[model samples]
Target: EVPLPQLRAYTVDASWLQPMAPLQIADHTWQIGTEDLTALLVQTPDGAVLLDGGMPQMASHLLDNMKARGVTPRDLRLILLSHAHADHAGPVAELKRRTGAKVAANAESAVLLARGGSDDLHFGDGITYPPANADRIVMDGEVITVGGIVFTAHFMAGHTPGSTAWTWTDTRNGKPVRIAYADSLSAPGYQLQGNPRYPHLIEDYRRSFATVRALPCDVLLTPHPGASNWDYAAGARAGAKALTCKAYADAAEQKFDGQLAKETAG
Candidate 1:
């Protein structure tokens, strides 16, 4: 229950991608194989579902973490990608090659990932991967149930074209607990408006912001650890993790507004 606090307060104001040790934050889940980037692993009865596989060079780190946790690459049945950014989805190719695990991504992001990523947002000239196409291309409002964990994916664009947010719900101690892993709504690298590559970017952000605010998030999680305020509850008891989703959504929406303002500023 003592997962390292996300590295925003310790590092610079907006640094969350530090590679930390494997921390078992929740039951059957570990914040493993990364520091700055996030590579969260969840174990299930059938197999494991890994969310965001970190950078390409960090593939071995992920593999090692999985093994350290007693699950090898062969135990990984599904890898759910949050977006097409290199730091998050870069290891998809290598991991898939080694584990032969099925990969899934938002339909929009799957195309970008297969094309080695584009300079649409974030890194210029964009970061490319080894062309591992997603076997299951999901969409907005899609609920994926694997390994006995059911989560709904919401298409929250802006950070990237296929930027996604997910919510997982289950009962703990006779009470409902909801874990929402919201994508990088805003940090250092993001584009909300005035972008040539992604059309209707502002529209998507607006809708996504509204949707994010509407979610009943009991525990807040982020793809980029920096966005999380681990001091409050975090991956601990449900009571402590409650009532933080509004602030999270509000902060992201404000950042999105600020970025969009700057992008459209005359």
Candidate 2:
């Protein structure tokens, strides 16, 4: 078993949409999003990388959170999206304009990101976000190095055609730790059977499960905080148990299986 590092305890309200102070969750990363939304800031000596933007209106929260941590707009170098969903890509346009950070995403997500989430596989025309162009197109298994921090992008398409999972190594209490930011595996309101937009939805979801299960992760961070069982409201008592990507993937697979069963039965 890998040794768990001493992480700071969170005391903020986990369910609130209000801005919360950035807390160091790992050696080189901090939670810069609100209690409900998740935006991670990976700090490197050269600059910083931001993963996932909250809701369109939640841009203010992320900006405030960064300011609290003394992360200037100029210090932010890159903005990576998990998928071009409204909640995660909503603030990308505003943030890109403010920080001048180069945005990166897989090819499929790049197209949706440029369109501002129009014609989403699940939400379709019901949801949209401010359009932001991808400065760089990242392919699966591509390694992105910025400011000495290396992040590996894994394409886990299912939730979104371009959904991605990121993994990187950072030290914690002198021990090297592998951390993974897994994408959402839930199929809320999704058409799992005979889907038109994404005909390969079921296959892709299963492949994603396999991809996530194979990742080497010691600490797991999801788009939603509670998905990984990391409760901020638990304060200092949180994260007592090891958070593994395999276990997280397993839970998602179980839910996916149930969803498939219900769809097939119905």
Candidate 3:
């Protein structure tokens, strides 16, 4: 049992409560949706890598996004998972089965991911998905290259063990702009102080903040589309504050750190 502090709870937005039309975020990158949840898609002539998927039942929505982008589910070459939460790891198995896409994720996150959502700490209550195998278990700081695109994986293991933060370079307006698809570090009733679900949960959140804060982020994306104001302007420019990774980490640390202290004080 856990007595979570009020400050640990996070506000959720249902703005994208249903599957939405895919949106182009970068020159070769698009965002896919599942019941307002998000997954990032990076494509090239060679193939495409899918970042995440929202739910197991959202497989049709996932396929539609691929079709809308002039591709087919079979075109997916790889799938990168952030964590084991339902909204992030939900469609991994089905998509993998359909496309035979190689799946990869942080070594730690692979545990819950391999078990489906049953091993998740926060959102695992009676929730389950068919377990998926991670074809490549990535280590922290590893650089994964697919279709000539490369991205570095960083560990941000708080929301679930092995929650990862991914940063890659995308060309925008002919200049290389860094794009970061970060894991959601906190949510309503998220634990910080004295969380028994994951070892060093508090420390993980602190380090997760520092990791994202240090990255160069010209575009910020989240697993839940509505959680952040990740809008784009004309010419496919990042409409919201472009460097949102640092901003999110800065505010998250300020809020969650204080919440931890508040919970500890009592």
- Candidate number of the best TM-score: 2
The pairs that clash in candidate 3 are 10-188, 16-36
- TM-scores for every predicted model: 0.82, 0.91, 0.86
Q: Which candidate model has the greater lDDT, 2 or 3?
A: 2
Worst 10 residues of 1 by lDDT: 7-16
Q: Rank order by lDDT, top first? A: 2, 3, 1
lDDT of 1 by residue, 1-266 (tens): 79996533112222334445577656666777455567778888888888888676778878888888888888998888777877788788889889948887888788878876754455665356667888998878898887788878888876777888877775556667777777776636555455576667778777777777777687776766656665221334413433366787788778767766776773
lDDT assessment of candidate 3 = 0.75
The models' CA-based lDDT, in order, is 0.72, 0.83, 0.75
Candidate order (TM-score): 2, 3, 1
Q: Write the per-residue lDDT of candidate 3 for residues 160-241, one digit (tens) a residue.
A: 7788888888787898878888888774466665667766777778888898888767777777544456543222444454
Candidate 2 TM-score, C-alpha based: 0.91
Off by over 4 Å in 3: 1-17, 231-238, 241-243
